[PDB]
Amino acid sequence: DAPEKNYERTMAILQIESEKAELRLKELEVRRLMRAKGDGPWFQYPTIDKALIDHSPKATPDN
Amino acid sequence: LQYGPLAYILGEKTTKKMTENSKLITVDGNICSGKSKLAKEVAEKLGLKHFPEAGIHYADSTTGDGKPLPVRFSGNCSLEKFYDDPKSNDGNSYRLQAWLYASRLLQYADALEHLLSTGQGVVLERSIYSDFVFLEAMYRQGFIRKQCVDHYNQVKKVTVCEYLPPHVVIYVDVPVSEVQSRIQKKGNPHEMKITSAYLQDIENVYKGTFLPEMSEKCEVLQYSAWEAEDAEKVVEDIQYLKYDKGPWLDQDDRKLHNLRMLVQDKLEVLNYTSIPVFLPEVTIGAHQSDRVFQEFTELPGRKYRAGYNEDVGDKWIWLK
Amino acid sequence: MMTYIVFILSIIFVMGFVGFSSKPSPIYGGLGLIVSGGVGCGIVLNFGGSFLGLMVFLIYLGGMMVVFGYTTAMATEQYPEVWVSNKVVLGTFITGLLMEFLMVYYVLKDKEVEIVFKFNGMGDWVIYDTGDSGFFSEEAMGIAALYSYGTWLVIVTGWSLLIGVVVIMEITRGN
Amino acid sequence: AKTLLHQYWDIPEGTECHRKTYAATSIGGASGLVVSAYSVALKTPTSFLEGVARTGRYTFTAAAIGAIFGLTSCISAQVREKPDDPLNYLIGGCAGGLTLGARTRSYGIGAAACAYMGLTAALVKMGQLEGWKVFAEPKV
Amino acid sequence: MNPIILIIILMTVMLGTIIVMISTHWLLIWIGFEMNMLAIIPIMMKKHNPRATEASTKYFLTQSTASMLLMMAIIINLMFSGQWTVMKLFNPMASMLMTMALAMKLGMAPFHFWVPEVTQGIPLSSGLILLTWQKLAPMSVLYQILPSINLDLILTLSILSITIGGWGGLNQTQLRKIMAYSSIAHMGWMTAVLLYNPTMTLLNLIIYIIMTSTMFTLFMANSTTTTLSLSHTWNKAPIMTILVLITLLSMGGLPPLSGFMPKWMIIQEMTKNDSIILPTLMAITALLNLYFYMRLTYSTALTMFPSTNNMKMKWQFPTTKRMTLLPTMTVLSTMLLPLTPILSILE
Amino acid sequence: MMTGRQARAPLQFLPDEARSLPPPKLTDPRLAYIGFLGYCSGLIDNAIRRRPVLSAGLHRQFLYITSFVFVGYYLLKRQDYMYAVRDHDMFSYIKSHPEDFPEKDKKTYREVFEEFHPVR
Amino acid sequence: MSLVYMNIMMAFTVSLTGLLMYRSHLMSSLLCLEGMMLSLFILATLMILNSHFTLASMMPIILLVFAACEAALGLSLLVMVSNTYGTDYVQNLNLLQC
Amino acid sequence: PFFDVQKKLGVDLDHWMTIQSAEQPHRIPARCHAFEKEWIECAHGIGSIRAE
Amino acid sequence: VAAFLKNVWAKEPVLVASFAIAGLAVILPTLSPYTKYSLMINRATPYNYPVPLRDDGNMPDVPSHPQDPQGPSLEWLKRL
Ligand SMILES: CCCCCCCCCCCCCCCCCC(=O)OC[C@H](COP(=O)(O)OCCN)OC(=O)CCCCCCCCCCCCCCCCC
Ligand SMILES: CCCCCCCCCCCCCCCCCC(=O)OC[C@H](COP(=O)(O)OCCN)OC(=O)CCCCCCCCCCCCCCCCC
Ligand SMILES: Nc1ncnc2c1ncn2[C@@H]1O[C@H](COP(=O)(O)O)[C@@H](O)[C@H]1O
């Protein structure tokens, strides 16, 4: 293979691997912030649905 | 496969073909009791299927083409050299005894499968309940050791407790002198060397150990030498019996189904025949069994499963 | 002291549990658990649990009669222990009694106690309702709705009882 | 007894000998009572005096381990004038290993206990220095 | 057993585990565990020998104690939360009690004292169901309450299960107690990464179920119960020695086999959270499991132990046993590592 | 981890948004590896039942190959879907929070002073 | 919390330790399991009748049912111990030690 | 693995005994009905970590 | 079906009466017109209070008084 061939192939490999490394570091930091806060689409542990609540007038009014 | 739990669920109940003719019969006796023909007579008046006596080569006759295999593949022992040399060092005696018990267990499995699948009774010769008595003669003449008897009783304890005793067991009273006279008139050059106390102890363990336990779990019909020669005598004395003894009565479709599922797996039948109890008469080593097994691979039709052999001319292997 | 009536019935409840928890013999175990179950429907019935306390009375009476039949049939020795035959029964029996009256003495002195949770020492007359329930006891309507809302609960409970019968017939077959 | 490990580690090294030795002895005694409870549980003593003699034996064994461990650690940290140094705990763990060997009446157990407990105490000092967490919080 | 009754009992076991898996209510979780126990008792008692009665007695006592602790945790959640959603528990006392209940249902150490006895007493298929299908329901309940599970308790139970299940398998020549202490070690492996990333816990669960089903299916296909009865396999069926070799080297965690897949991923999810000591000790303790796996491969495949005479008859019969999914389980138990990123289907 | 995302579409293997993604090729090397797993399952199934391993059951080996390819194709589609949802949620979260992720001043090495450590 | 919850949890712990420490007799531990179910019944029913959450008032009934729906199982698992052995001691159940 | 069959098939197996504010027999209120309604509508959708 | 019915009516007649009563109790509430009257009696029984509504202005079937003609009637219950 040519030296230009191997050289520019090496540069494409380095671009792809540096992008994957920066995105893995972003992946770690995003998981850290979402487990710390819980504001993102991940780590939404389930709570009670608010559609189950009976909104009709009940028997006694003290409720 | 042919039978399983699905066919039992889909209506094949084993008491749809359990009639009064379903009588598993076994004719016991000494070496030359005139009984080996008599079983055929009991086979040819009651309309039953005769199994011959399981020698070394019973499993050789069941699977494959049925020709007699060489002795180094099956048993690796001898009966003639047992008769010439009962007190050998290499242990022809217990090796031949254990191989005969394995062959008779396969014979009894085939008998129960034919009986529980075809509705036709099977006439055996010297079934597995009448095998250990021969071991006792080989213990009463000093042919084997105590550890071989312990090994055989462990094997028979773990193999016979899952079966049933037969319906009718025929026993033949021939005294020792008439057995010896028929041996001498046979002219068999190896059979003549059998000692007399061996045969007397065969008769003693017949009368004192076999029949005091089988008479309560099957039905005895004890015949002498002269009355075991008429066929219709023994046939009709089977034909008018009142069957209450034995564990054949408390058997429904479920228990006979579990027996039939145990029987039709022949490797599960023969699973604990060769238990790993290290005994010098039966333990065949690594390279010897390796050489004999790689020669068994080269036997014609024996390399693959029973419909996957081009050397015997099997068709459609590439669609099986 | 009379306002502590659910407390007093619950002291009898714990005393019955000490009585059959030292395991003297299942005859006297049946006695102690009949006493504890019979005051269980004195504890829970002073809340409004008429039906739902009578059930834990009745089902446990059937249970202790069957338990009697088995401990008379299979679980019987020659000298059954009353409570005082073995020393190791009576020691932990007296231990349970003095430890229960120890925490009684600690809860009627301080009116607060904490074994791991925190418990008031005033009687449980304070925690009731000041309202009416109309022409129905509310727990009777709740167990009446076992057939209206609770469809899946009825299905799985009937299937569990069915296969419990089948399981027990497959176990006590012997072969 | 997590608070026992607190009031062991809530005292600076090379300052107070007898209180640290008492805290290490108490931690050793708690470990010995755990081993004593499982020993009278999983293997039945043929007498109650058999069981309490085994309980006292295991209790004094682990208490002597903790005592000579913390004592040698504190004395070496004082007399070397290096408080945050794992060689002090290394010598303390080896002294506890020879303690366990003298209580089990065997030399090779004592030498192996010297070596492996010295490695263990070195790991404890380094995990106390760099903040190594064994039961670490899930955070990412 | 009547095969209709056996099919109804197996459907009831599956129904109990499904009722644990699909229900949002704590009482239905408890009813699912009750149904699962009640319908797995006759699977342990299919052959009616006193060893099975001892095994079923010990199993029923342990699972009944666990069910009592589970219902007390449920009632304490009802106290401190006033509701019934299967979600995080609203009390650390209730979380501790439910963790104890699920740990007794899994047989995690030091509640592991029933798994080798019960696994030895019962037949091979019942042991397979006990070691695979009974590890689906309490791991489901542990999956659904992980924001309330205390960290130190579940890590202590996990690493204690790993160490004790590593040591317990070294002194057993019986195959089923080997698989039982392997089960204790692998449940420790699963629950150690539960609070960190539970998708890897589900991955470890599924890979362990595939490997354990491969091992018990080989044990049923050769009808072997001990190491010494497995020793004659090269004379009976030589390809089965290759299969038990590759599966026993898979379960220890040797690359490039699939059992290196969960373990390494567990370390991949424990060094993320600044915990380097604990997966190191787990990786060291995996060598004990791998050691008695190497012992079983030395006995079976890599050498040739001496056989006996009557094997010469068993040469003449093919295995007519229903070897259900055995090549599929073999291939998915040894050659799965290049598809390590398949774990995202469990997210 | 992502259990809040897959709670509005429960028990859906591939959602409606999963079709927006390019599917794996029919010459996918991962699916070809699963086809090799099917070929090995066919060979093991002919080996454990003492059949001629390369000749017996052409339909049997071909159905093993077809079955593993048919399972593995949908498994690879769910794999691609879940990693795509992971990157989509990551990038939308990074875009939604600018104050959590500073853009560094990407210096050059003529200002950054590294400590040299010679080998001698 | 209130006073009666102390004694019901105390009865739970007493029946727990009675179950969790044997006396070489298995029927007496079946009784301790049924006692633990009694304590669970009373505690859940006190909580439900206190909160006036009536719809789970069917919950103790179901609870009590599954009590005997395992305890009768133990009875079927008792006689299979006591048909093998003349007694039902727990030291007859040590053949799974090898 | 929370296989949510009840939301998949649309069936309603045990979403009625779950809370004290659900549909009751003859509209019997609970003594913490208003507080549990406020806590459920306060903590719906915002997840456990923010809801605690 | 008649011959086996006579046979089981000879052998086990209590079981025949049991299965007959059970089968009729299963099938017969789907062949009777009174079941709608059962449901309407059960839902026309006012346990709670008939909670009034705020008059926003336009409810053409809601009364202002019990003796107003609009609303559900129960004269069918008194006739039947
Ligand atoms: C995180 C949640 C994940 C949920 C995944 C759910 C997947 C399906 C369920 C898997 C769990 C195991 C369930 C089955 C356990 C064993 C059932 C059983 O005992 O079946 C009886 C049968 C008997 O066969 P035989 O050998 O003839 O019997 C001898 C007589 N005793 O057969 C046997 O004993 C042989 C084994 C039968 C089952 C093998 C197949 C399932 C497990 C292996 C993986 C196969 C690959 C495909 C599925 C991958 C996912 C598990
Ligand atoms: C359809 C509605 C739902 C039906 C199922 C639910 C019924 C609920 C009522 C309670 C029933 C509980 C007991 C049921 C037991 C049935 C099984 C049985 O007893 O079979 C055996 C019996 C013969 O007795 P044997 O086996 O000889 O006993 C040994 C010595 N006594 O065999 C018999 O006696 C034969 C009994 C079957 C034939 C009865 C036919 C009755 C027909 C009545 C008119 C038609 C009614 C419509 C429904 C017909 C349903 C078949
Ligand atoms: N279990 C056994 N042990 C020793 N010899 C046996 C046994 N069973 C059969 N034989 C011999 O088998 C031969 C039977 O041949 P025949 O009676 O002519 O069919 C006799 O020589 C018997 O001694």
Curated annotation (Swiss-Prot), chain C:
One Pfam family here: Oxidored_q3
Function: Core subunit of the mitochondrial membrane respiratory chain NADH dehydrogenase (Complex I) which catalyzes electron transfer from NADH through the respiratory chain, using ubiquinone as an electron acceptor. Essential for the catalytic activity and assembly of complex I.
Membrane topology: Multi-pass membrane protein
UniProt entry tagged with the keyword Transmembrane helix: yes
Protein name (record): NADH-ubiquinone oxidoreductase chain 6
Family the UniProt entry places it in: Belongs to the complex I subunit 6 family.
Location within or outside the cell: Mitochondrion inner membrane
UniProtKB/Swiss-Prot annotation, chain E:
Catalytic activity: a ubiquinone + NADH + 5 H(+)(in) = a ubiquinol + NAD(+) + 4 H(+)(out)
One Gene Ontology term from the biological process aspect of the record: mitochondrial electron transport, NADH to ubiquinone
Pfam family, one: NADH_dehy_S2_C
Swiss-Prot/TrEMBL keywords: Electron transport, Membrane, Mitochondrion, Mitochondrion inner membrane, NAD, Respiratory chain, Translocase, Transmembrane, Transmembrane helix, Transport, Ubiquinone
Presence of keyword Zinc: no
Topology class, membrane: Multi-pass membrane protein
Intracellular or extracellular location(s): Mitochondrion inner membrane
Domain of life per record: Eukaryota
Assembly notes: Core subunit of respiratory chain NADH dehydrogenase (Complex I) which is composed of 45 different subunits. Interacts with TMEM242.
InterPro entries: Complex_I_Subunit_2, NADH_DH_su2_C, NADH_UbQ_OxRdtase_chain2, ND/Mrp_TM
EC id: 7.1.1.2
Residue spans crossing the bilayer: 3-23, 25-45, 67-87, 96-116, 122-142, 145-165, 178-198, 200-220, 237-257, 274-294, 325-345
Name of the molecule in the record: NADH-ubiquinone oxidoreductase chain 2
Key word Electron transport present: yes
Known role: Core subunit of the mitochondrial membrane respiratory chain NADH dehydrogenase (Complex I) which catalyzes electron transfer from NADH through the respiratory chain, using ubiquinone as an electron acceptor. Essential for the catalytic activity and assembly of complex I.
GO cellular component, one term: mitochondrial inner membrane
MF GO annotations: NADH dehydrogenase (ubiquinone) activity
Source organism per UniProt: Ovis aries
Swiss-Prot record, chain G:
Chief location category: mitochondrion
Compartment(s) of residence: Mitochondrion inner membrane
Enzyme Commission code: 7.1.1.2
Domain of life: Eukaryota
Pfam family, one: Oxidored_q2
Alphabetically ordered keywords of this record: Electron transport, Membrane, Mitochondrion, Mitochondrion inner membrane, NAD, Respiratory chain, Translocase, Transmembrane, Transmembrane helix, Transport, Ubiquinone
Keyword Transport belongs to the record: yes
Function of the protein: Core subunit of the mitochondrial membrane respiratory chain NADH dehydrogenase (Complex I) which catalyzes electron transfer from NADH through the respiratory chain, using ubiquinone as an electron acceptor. Part of the enzyme membrane arm which is embedded in the lipid bilayer and involved in proton translocation.
Stated name of the protein: NADH-ubiquinone oxidoreductase chain 4L
Source organism phylogeny: Eukaryota, Metazoa, Chordata, Craniata, Vertebrata
